[PDB]
Structure formats: structure tokens, C-alpha cells
Amino acid sequence: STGSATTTPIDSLDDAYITPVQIGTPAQTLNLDFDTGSSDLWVFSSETTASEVDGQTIYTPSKSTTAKLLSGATWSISYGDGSSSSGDVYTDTVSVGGLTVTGQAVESAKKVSSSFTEDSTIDGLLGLAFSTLNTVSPTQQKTFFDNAKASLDSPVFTADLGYHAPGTYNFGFIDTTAYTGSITYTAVSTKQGFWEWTSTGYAVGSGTFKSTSIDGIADTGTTLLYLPATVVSAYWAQVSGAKSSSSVGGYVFPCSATLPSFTFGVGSARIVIPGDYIDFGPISTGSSSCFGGIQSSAGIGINIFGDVALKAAFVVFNGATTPTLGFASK
Numbered sequence: 258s259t260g261s262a263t264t265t266p267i268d269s270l271d272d273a274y275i276t277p278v279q280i281g282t283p284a285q286t287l288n289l290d291f292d293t294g295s296s297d298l299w300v301f302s303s304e305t306t307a308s309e310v311d312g313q314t315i316y317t318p319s320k321s322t323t324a325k326l327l328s329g330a331t332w333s334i335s336y337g338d339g340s341s342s343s344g345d346v347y348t349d350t351v352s353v354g355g356l357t358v359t360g361q362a363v364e365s366a367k368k369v370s371s372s373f374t375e376d377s378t379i380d381g382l383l384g385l386a387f388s389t390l391n392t393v394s395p396t397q398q399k400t401f402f403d404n405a406k407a408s409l410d411s412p413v414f415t416a417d418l419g420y421h422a423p424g425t426y427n428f429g430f431i432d433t434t435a436y437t438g439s440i441t442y443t444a445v446s447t448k449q450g451f452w453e454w455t456s457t458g459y460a461v462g463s464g465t466f467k468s469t470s471i472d473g474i475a476d477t478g479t480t481l482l483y484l485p486a487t488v489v490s491a492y493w494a495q496v497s498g499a500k501s502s503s504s505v506g507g508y509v510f511p512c513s514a515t516l517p518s519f520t521f522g523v524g525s526a527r528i529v530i531p532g533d534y535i536d537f538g539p540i541s542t543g544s545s546s547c548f549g550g551i552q553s554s555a556g557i558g559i560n561i562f563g564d565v566a567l568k569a570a571f572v573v574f575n576g577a578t579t580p581t582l583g584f585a586s587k
């Protein structure tokens with residue numbers, strides 16, 4: 258089997274992407290944030306505290322003939338950005354782009370933190386990291402990808418995120434028309450439960466490539482590119498007027514600037530992020546100070562190849578017995 262679904266930016270800055278997902282019988286379609294940095298499939302629901310729902314589409318398990326309470330199971334998750342959610346668990350039929358999994362754990366939110374409530378466009382998350390990170394207790398549950406894997410033509414999914422435009426998540430096949438040149442594959446460590454890999458270096462604009470190992474994660478659920486302070490300082494030093502602002506919480510730059518590109522290495526291959534991809538617009542409405550899309554990972558403990566980086570590539574998440582990651586230009 259295979260699946261193919263379009264993923265769409267939630268706003269004009271590409272802050273996140275949503276992908277329609279069919280849950281239950283008859284189908285209830287919710288727009289979920291596919292997150293290769295976490296491993297829980299959770300949704301706003303009929304059980305979510307009413308004051309914490311503001312415009313989201315909810316899953317109502319009582320209206321699904323295939324929903325079954327997973328007795329005694331609870332979940333609770335805290336994300337890198339400080340947001341969180343928790344609740345109980347059903348199993349139900351879940352389909353993405355024509356690919357169907359029966360008996361998928363669907364984690365029903367009883368509580369969500371303010372940032373979720375405040376984002377009416379995201380109805381929940383669909384985790385695509387390794388199932389070892391799944392938070393369901395007392396019986397840990399598998400991701401949609403893990404459940405689907407044995408049925409897929411090939412044990413892979415791909416992320417093709419657009420810049421200010423829709424893109425695609427494919428399951429079970431590699432669309433050879435969706436990228437240019439060849440795909441370069443690189444080793445993954447699953448020890449922390451992430452799609453963790455090591456970039457071979459970077460360049461700023463038309464500058465020379467610096468060969469240096471940068472260990473990080475491929476995370477579709479993180480907006481920005483978070484790299485070591487040395488790398489980030491080298492990037493922003495090429496932008497007149499750019500500075501790190503403790504009050505804003507990172508590097509800002511004059512909105513009048515033209516940003517240089519940023520290149521990262523994948524083995525001997527190179528992925529170029531155009532400068533425009535690094536512009537996240539005014540820090541507040543009407544400001545001439547703009548927020549940068551490359552930020553320091555120093556306070557995080559891990560480097561993060563988030564959407565800013567991933568959207569510049571066609572990315573293969575290879576879930577073979579020994580997982581790997583592939584990157585191509587597009």
C-alpha cells in the first residue's frame with residue numbers, strides 16, 4: 258500500500274503545516290501537524306475542556322462505530338516550545354492520503370495548553386518519530402508509520418514541505434518526479450528516539466564551505482533551524498544590523514535587509530536554503546525589526562533541522578531495519 262496527502266502552511270510565515278487525516282467511521286477529518294520530532298497522535302476532542310477549545314475541529318469517539326476506549330490508558334506530553342497536552346486513549350481507524358491503519362491509538366485530549374487553544378488551525382499532532390518516545394501509559398503505543406510499515410510497498414515516508422506553498426507527505430514510496438538530482442542518504446541514530454543525523458558542515462551565502470560535524474534532528478514539527486552558537490553568529494554577521502535580542506528571544510534583523518542563503522552538508526552533497534526562507538517577518542505588527550529563521554540551539558541541548566531547513570529539500574525518512582535519512586534538492 259501507499260498514501261499521499263497534501264500538507265498546507267497554517268499562515269503566511271509557514272509557522273507549521275497541516276495535513277488532513279480521516280479518523281473513525283464514518284470519517285471525521287481533522288487537520289493535524291505531522292511531527293517527526295514526537296511520537297503521539299493526539300487530537301482535540303469532545304472530551305477536551307470546553308474553555309480550551311477555540312475554533313478547532315474535534316474528534317467525537319462516541320460518533321465512531323470503530324472507536325474503542327483503550328481501558329486504563331492515559332497520555333501526557335510536553336513539547337520543546339513549552340506547550341503541552343494530556344488525556345485518555347481510543348483505538349480507531351485512521352487514514353492518511355488513502356493509506357489506512359486499523360487499531361491506531363488516537364490520544365484524546367482532556368487538557369491542552371494555551372498555545373494550542375490559541376491556534377485554531379491545528380486540530381492535533383501526528384507523531385512520526387520513533388515509537389519509543391510515545392507517552393501512553395501503562396502500555397506504550399505505536400505511531401501511525403510504525404503500524405503502517407509492514408503494509409507499505411517500501412518502509413519509508415517522505416516530507417516535501419513548500420515555501421509559502423503546499424507540499425506533500427508520501428507513505429510507502431519515493432516520488433522520483435519530486436526532486437532534482439540524486440538523493441544522498443546519511444546514517445541515523447535512534448538512541449534518543451529521534452531522526453538524529455550528522456550534517457557535514459555549512460556555508461553562509463557565497464562563502465566557503467566549513468567542514469564540521471553537526472549532530473541534529475530532522476523535525477518537521479519545529480518551525481526554525483537551530484544550530485550551534487558559533488554557526489549562527491557566523492550567519493548573522495553577514496547581515497547588516499542583525500543582533501541577538503534577549504528581549505525578543507533570538508536574532509533579529511532589519512526588515513530592509515536582503516538575507517544570504519545558508520547551505521548545509523549531507524555527506525558530500527549540499528542543500529541550499531534561500532535567504533528568503535530565513536525571514537520570519539516583523540517581531541510585532543508594524544515593526545521594522547524582523548525575526549530570524551536561524552537561531553542558536555545553545556539552550557536546547559540538541560541541534561534542530563526544522564522546517565526552515567527541511568522545506569529546502571525532498572526528505573526521505575527510511576524506516577528499514579537500520580533507519581537512514583535521505584536528502585535531495587528540488
Ligand SMILES: NC[C@@H](O)c1ccc(F)cc1
Nearest residue numbers: 294295336337478479559
Ligand atoms: N517537534 C517536537 C518538539 O517537542 C521538539 C523540540 C525540540 C527538540 F529538540 C525535539 C523535539
